[PDB]
Design a protein around this ligand. Structure first.
Ligand SMILES: O=C1CC(I)=CC=N1
Length: 181
């Protein structure tokens, strides 16, 4: 409808795939080459389905901060025959708050879904499903089951991936440029 949705659509159309694990179907953001991200609670194994194609996982790393606290981001390298458009220059270099963000989801349950979530708070610490988690972004939208892995954008920046909600608020794990050097 506006330039927020324009940027979100450009990321969804070229940099997302549908990832299926034994824990469900997720929006999965491709960042560069064969490297993508997914919430750690997806429990990625040796094999994953990418757009319903059986795919070997060449490497997977559950990120933690230097306090050894969960970040809820897993970086995956896929045995895929095609590279992602390199979007690393759209990743923030620091923790920050944002105005006017969009949460974008693409699965069998939620095809071509775009949610204007509004202001995003650097929330920091969250007990997420009982796991202490750092670098959490918060938005005041009642997100639902099936939106995990959804991409959080502003105009010109890809700032996080949706990892949970409490029925009134939604929470994303930050994406930082330093994760993908
Ligand atoms: O919070 C929500 C999500 C959705 I999809 C529909 C209605 N409310």
């Amino acid at each position: 409808m506006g330039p927020g949705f324009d940027f979100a659509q450009a990321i969804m159309k070229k940099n997302t795939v549908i990832a299926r694990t034994e824990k469900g179907e997720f929006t999965m953001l491709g960042v560069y080459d064969r490297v993508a991200v997914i919430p750690t609670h997806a429990s990625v194994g040796e094999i994953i389905y990418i757009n319903d194609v059986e795919t070997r996982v060449l490497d997977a790393c559950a990120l933690r901060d230097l306090t050894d606290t969960n970040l809820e981001i897993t970086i995956v390298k896929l045995d895929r025959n095609q590279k992602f458009r390199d979007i690393r220059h759209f990743l923030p270099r620091c923790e920050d708050d944002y105005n006017d963000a969009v949460l974008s989801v693409h699965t069998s349950k939620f095809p071509n879904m775009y949610i204007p979530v509004g202001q995003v708070t650097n929330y920091g610490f969250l007990n997420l499903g009982g796991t202490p988690t750092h670098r959490i972004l918060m938005y005041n939208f009642p997100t639902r089951a099936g939106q995990c892995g959804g991409v959080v954008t502003t105009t010109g920046k890809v700032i996080g991936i949706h990892v949970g909600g409490n029925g009134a608020q939604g929470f994303a794990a930050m994406l930082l440029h330093s994760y993908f050097t």
